[PDB]
Amino acid sequence: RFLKVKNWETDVVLTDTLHLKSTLETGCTEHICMGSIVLPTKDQLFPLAKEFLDQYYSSIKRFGSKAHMDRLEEVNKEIESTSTYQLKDTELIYGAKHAWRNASRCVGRIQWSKLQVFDARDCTTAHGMFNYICNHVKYATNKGNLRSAITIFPQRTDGKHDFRVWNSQLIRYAGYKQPDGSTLGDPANVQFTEICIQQGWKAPRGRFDVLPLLLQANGNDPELFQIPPELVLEVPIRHPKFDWFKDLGLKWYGLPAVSNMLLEIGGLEFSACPFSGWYMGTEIGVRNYCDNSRYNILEEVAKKMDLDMRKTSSLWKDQALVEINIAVLYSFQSDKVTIVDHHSATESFIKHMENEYRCRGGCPADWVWIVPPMSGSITPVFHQEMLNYRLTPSFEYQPDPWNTHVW
Amino acid sequence: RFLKVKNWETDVVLTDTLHLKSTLETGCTEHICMGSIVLPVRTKDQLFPLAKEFLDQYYSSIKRFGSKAHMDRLEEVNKEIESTSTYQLKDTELIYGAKHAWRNASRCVGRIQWSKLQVFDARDCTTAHGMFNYICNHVKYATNKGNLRSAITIFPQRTDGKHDFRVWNSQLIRYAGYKQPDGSTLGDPANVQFTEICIQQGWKAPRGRFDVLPLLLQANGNDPELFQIPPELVLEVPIRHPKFDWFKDLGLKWYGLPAVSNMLLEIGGLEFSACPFSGWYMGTEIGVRNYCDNSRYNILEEVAKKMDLDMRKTSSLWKDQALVEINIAVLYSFQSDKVTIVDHHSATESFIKHMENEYRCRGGCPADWVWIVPPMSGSITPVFHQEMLNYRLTPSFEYQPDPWNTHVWKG
Numbered sequence: 001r002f003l004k005v006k007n008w009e010t011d012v013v014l015t016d017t018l019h020l021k022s023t024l025e026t027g028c029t030e031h032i033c034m035g036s037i038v039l040p041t042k043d044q045l046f047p048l049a050k051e052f053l054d055q056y057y058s059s060i061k062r063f064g065s066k067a068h069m070d071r072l073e074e075v076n077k078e079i080e081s082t083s084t085y086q087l088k089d090t091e092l093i094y095g096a097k098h099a100w101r102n103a104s105r106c107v108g109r110i111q112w113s114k115l116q117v118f119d120a121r122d123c124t125t126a127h128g129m130f131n132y133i134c135n136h137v138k139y140a141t142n143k144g145n146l147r148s149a150i151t152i153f154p155q156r157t158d159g160k161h162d163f164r165v166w167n168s169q170l171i172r173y174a175g176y177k178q179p180d181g182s183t184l185g186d187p188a189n190v191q192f193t194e195i196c197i198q199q200g201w202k203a204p205r206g207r208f209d210v211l212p213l214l215l216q217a218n219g220n221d222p223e224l225f226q227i228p229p230e231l232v233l234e235v236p237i238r239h240p241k242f243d244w245f246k247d248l249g250l251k252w253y254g255l256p257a258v259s260n261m262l263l264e265i266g267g268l269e270f271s272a273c274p275f276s277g278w279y280m281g282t283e284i285g286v287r288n289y290c291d292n293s294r295y296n297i298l299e300e301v302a303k304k305m306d307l308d309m310r311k312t313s314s315l316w317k318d319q320a321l322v323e324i325n326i327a328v329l330y331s332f333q334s335d336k337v338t339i340v341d342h343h344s345a346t347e348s349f350i351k352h353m354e355n356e357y358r359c360r361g362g363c364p365a366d367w368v369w370i371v372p373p374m375s376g377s378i379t380p381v382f383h384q385e386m387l388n389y390r391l392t393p394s395f396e397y398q399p400d401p402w403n404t405h406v407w
Numbered sequence: 408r409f410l411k412v413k414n415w416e417t418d419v420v421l422t423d424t425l426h427l428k429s430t431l432e433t434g435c436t437e438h439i440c441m442g443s444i445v446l447p448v449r450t451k452d453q454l455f456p457l458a459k460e461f462l463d464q465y466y467s468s469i470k471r472f473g474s475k476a477h478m479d480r481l482e483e484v485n486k487e488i489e490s491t492s493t494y495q496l497k498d499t500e501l502i503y504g505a506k507h508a509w510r511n512a513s514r515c516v517g518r519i520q521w522s523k524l525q526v527f528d529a530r531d532c533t534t535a536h537g538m539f540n541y542i543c544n545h546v547k548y549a550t551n552k553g554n555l556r557s558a559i560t561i562f563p564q565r566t567d568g569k570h571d572f573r574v575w576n577s578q579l580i581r582y583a584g585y586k587q588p589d590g591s592t593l594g595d596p597a598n599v600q601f602t603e604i605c606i607q608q609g610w611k612a613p614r615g616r617f618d619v620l621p622l623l624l625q626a627n628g629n630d631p632e633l634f635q636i637p638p639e640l641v642l643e644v645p646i647r648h649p650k651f652d653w654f655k656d657l658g659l660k661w662y663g664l665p666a667v668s669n670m671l672l673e674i675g676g677l678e679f680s681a682c683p684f685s686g687w688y689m690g691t692e693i694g695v696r697n698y699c700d701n702s703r704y705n706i707l708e709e710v711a712k713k714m715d716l717d718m719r720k721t722s723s724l725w726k727d728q729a730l731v732e733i734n735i736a737v738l739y740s741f742q743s744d745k746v747t748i749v750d751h752h753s754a755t756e757s758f759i760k761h762m763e764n765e766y767r768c769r770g771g772c773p774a775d776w777v778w779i780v781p782p783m784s785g786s787i788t789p790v791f792h793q794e795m796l797n798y799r800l801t802p803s804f805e806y807q808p809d810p811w812n813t814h815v816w817k818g
């Protein structure tokens with residue numbers, strides 16, 4: 001029932017009681033652990049609504065009050081007659097902040113309660129979506145002093161009227177396969193980049209082409225839109241000591257803004273719900289630049305540091321990886337754009353765990369995702385036992401709509 | 408029912424059917440994953456099925472499943488069990504047994520090596536002194552003057568669990584750590600408690616940053632007794648850096664032979680509570696963990712100082728810079744002295760070919776992602792991008808409590 005988590009660096013032991021209020025399934029059984037797998041009705045809706053509203057009213061310390069009780073009735077009546085219901089603004093804001101609070105894969109949740117919510121449930125068209133998004137981008141960016149935000153489009157209905165942002169992030173770079181055989185730009189977005197061009201995007205066909213947005217309103221065929229270039233804050237990448245570094249022509253964008261997820265609040269499904277905070281340095285320096293499936297630039301970088309690339313045991317990949325990441329951090333900082341390093345992020349996430357443990361009775365955390373893709377054991381989270389479980393409200397991965405929609 | 412794992416870098420999808428032969432539990436449920444938790448006397452009743460399972464396995468793999476030879480051995484073990492309540496493994500079974508425990512060790516990146524394991528059978532051992540000598544020979548053979556070879560020594564199985572063979576050291580070779588009256592430890596901090604226990608049994612401690620602790624050995628459930636590994640048997644590598652000449656002046660060395668002595672080898676239901684095993688190091692075990700954990704030698708501060716890194720903001724990645732140099736030094740030192748070591752790139756790459764081969768020939772390979780991915784440079788090693796299934800197969804190595812917590816003293 002009660003379960004302990006031990007930190008093996010500090011010996012601090014925490015007791016998790018929050019898991020018993022756990023809802024969905026993990027993918028694991030008594031027989032098999034799936035911790036490292038990336039993807040493991042009126043009757044159905046009311047329990048979900050009730051469960052959500054009970055946590056809301058308890059959170060505002062009016063559990064069992066008439067204000068509480070009255071609301072449970074109204075939602076039930078609306079379900080029985082309308083087949084869905086609408087969240088109050090208070091509920092929407094609480095629902096959103098908690099979906100982030102419950103995201104077991106996010107190292108940055110110390111911040112969870114500072115989420116600016118933009119209610120875009122009155123949106124009806126893709127142009128409308130584009131407007132709400134540009135406003136999201138500008139508010140969030142704040143000329144480099146980034147602030148967390150999420151924008152919530154209308155909730156699923158019969159499911160054929162879904163609002164969706166097709167891009168996986170508001171801001172990402174194109175990818176083109178070349179007659180050469182290699183790939184120009186980001187090969188993560190190759191498919192999506194063709195889909196855009198296959199819908200009349202004049203792609204400048206470069207390495208760092210900011211992609212156009214594909215907005216789907218009300219289950220309609222989606223449309224292209226170019227984020228005002230002045231709204232996309234980008235950072236040229238230089239090193240505090242390697243002068244030649246800029247000659248690689250590396251740039252990255254300041255705003256990570258995840259837009260392919262599904263927000264579930266009290267049984268309601270918000271299928272377009274882009275949110276954004278700010279980067280941990282390693283997301284760009286380690287993953288975006290150094291993954292083989294990505295910009296994959298280690299080979300070329302080590303070659304400029306004059307490192308011995310003849311044997312893996314010289315650790316040249318490792319030397320170059322550090323420098324690449326020093327440079328990302330330095331570049332963003334020089335330009336006063338919010339970024340956080342993995343030491344500082346993970347340190348803040350331990351403080352946030354301890355808070356969640358005494359304050360909430362626990363904190364679902366996915367260790368595989370929380371530990372940075374560099375220097376794991378020199379970050380405090382490496383030594384921290386974490387329990388992983390699915391609470392609601394939540395964000396959930398949804399598959400690329402192009403796999404789904406018809407025209 | 409088949410399960411698939413994806414490699415997110417290569418898009419290679421594998422199909423695991425071996426998880427179907429798993430019986431033991433994981434600590435996980437449909438409602439909780441305990442994937443990151445470190446730790447999540449047997450009756451005749453339960454024993455024969457475990458024997459039977461095991462021997463069905465052995466005979467399958469030698470291609471004798473169903474043979475008169477297989478049925479005879481089942482019957483013979485059967486009888487032996489109800490007559491004497493336990494049973495003895497044949498040699499061929501013991502060897503098969505201990506290879507498979509390593510094979511099934513899901514937290515072990517070194518398994519491409521599994522079929523090459525030198526089993527020493529120490530099941531005629533009866534005293535601690537007997538234990539010392541078996542172990543000395545283990546260490547000599549395994550070392551092989553720096554050209555390390557994998558080995559395990561198996562002392563007698565548990566009986567009533569009142570007569571256990573134990574090695575009190577968690578590794579056969581490990582440095583002392585001595586807590587000072589001011590809170591600083593002198594030496595490796597992981598071994599403070601064991602160090603004191605040794606000191607208590609009358610070991611006279613040199614008290615330096617690198618003293619090789621004595622073996623504490625328990626035979627037949629008896630109290631244990633001290634013993635010095637002969638120093639000429641203990642291969643050590645002083646740590647220097649290829650370009651940094653001041654690195655040697657930090658006075659660091661490490662031992663060559665990693666030899667886990669605190670685990671339990673279960674084969675066909677039998678429990679071998681002393682089965683020290685040894686292989687060779689992946690460099691990061693020393694360079695990242697042993698040296699750079701805060702709870703270990705903690706040399707980061709000292710190394711980065713000497714390198715003149717900017718130490719006033721963590722965002723200089725000074726800590727990350729110093730970590731790499733230390734790891735370069737470890738691999739450099741070991742190669743220079745011709746002591747076997749493998750780097751984390753080479754090791755994870757081998758594990759991937761191993762894993763892939765293990766799906767092809769065995770229908771799977773249990774693997775614990777959290778332990779397999781190295782504790783530095785995770786994503787630039789290919790295991791990071793590897794989906795893994797973790798499950799428990801027997802034979803197996805199990806953790807067991809430190810015995811001073813359990814052992815009842817005779818005095």
Ligand code: HEM
Nearest residue numbers: 100103105106107108111148149275276277278279280395
């Ligand atoms: C404020 C700074 C933030 C930091 C530093 C941060 C950090 C991260 C990181 C490092 C990851 C995994 C990254 C990856 O490799 O893909 C992640 C995942 C995630 N984060 Fe955050 N986060 C922040 C803000 C937010 C916000 C505002 C939300 C939503 C309100 C959020 C929700 C999520 C979710 C749902 C995931 C899992 C994504 C997936 O499955 O692909 N985070 N976070």
Ligand code: HEM
Nearest residue numbers: 509512514515516517520557558684685686687688689804
């Ligand atoms: C060929 C040399 C080997 C290499 C490079 C290697 C690699 C490793 C590493 C790096 C670990 C985890 C290290 C740690 O953090 O404690 C490990 C764990 C383990 N290995 Fe190996 N291994 C090797 C040989 C062996 C052998 C010969 C056996 C048994 C015959 C074995 C069985 C195990 C077991 C049971 C664990 C888990 C230990 C625990 O849970 O504390 N390995 N392996």
Ligand SMILES: Cc1cc(N)nc(C[C@@H]2CNC[C@@H]2OCCNCCc2cccc(F)c2)c1
Nearest residue numbers: 038039256257258275276277278279280283397
């Ligand atoms: C297949 C699949 C499943 C899943 N759940 N997720 C993905 C996105 C991939 C995975 N891992 C990297 C990449 O996502 C790209 C990075 N995501 C940014 C997370 C972040 C950081 C700071 C602030 C934020 F608002 C958000 C793919």
Ligand SMILES: Cc1cc(N)nc(C[C@@H]2CNC[C@@H]2OCCNCCc2cccc(F)c2)c1
Nearest residue numbers: 445446578665666667684685686687688689806
């Ligand atoms: C509590 C607990 C449970 C468990 N299963 N294990 C431990 C040992 C920890 C793991 N990490 C630090 C320390 O183990 C240090 C010893 N690990 C060497 C593994 C190895 C490498 C190469 C060849 C070999 F034969 C063996 C503690």
Ligand SMILES: C[C@H](O)[C@H](O)[C@H]1CNc2nc(N)[nH]c(=O)c2N1
Nearest residue numbers: 036037038368369791792793794
């Ligand atoms: C297969 C494995 O689960 C996969 O590569 C994971 C590992 N940990 C991760 N961790 C984070 N933060 N982001 C990721 O994309 C991944 N990928």
Ligand SMILES: C[C@H](O)[C@H](O)[C@H]1CNc2nc(N)[nH]c(=O)c2N1
Nearest residue numbers: 382383384385443444445777778
């Ligand atoms: C809490 C966490 O499970 C623990 O610190 C683990 C993580 N992964 C590890 N991986 C290896 N190889 N060795 C370890 O000691 C650990 N420690």
Ligand SMILES: [Zn+2]
Nearest residue numbers: 028033435440
């Ligand atoms: Zn699990």
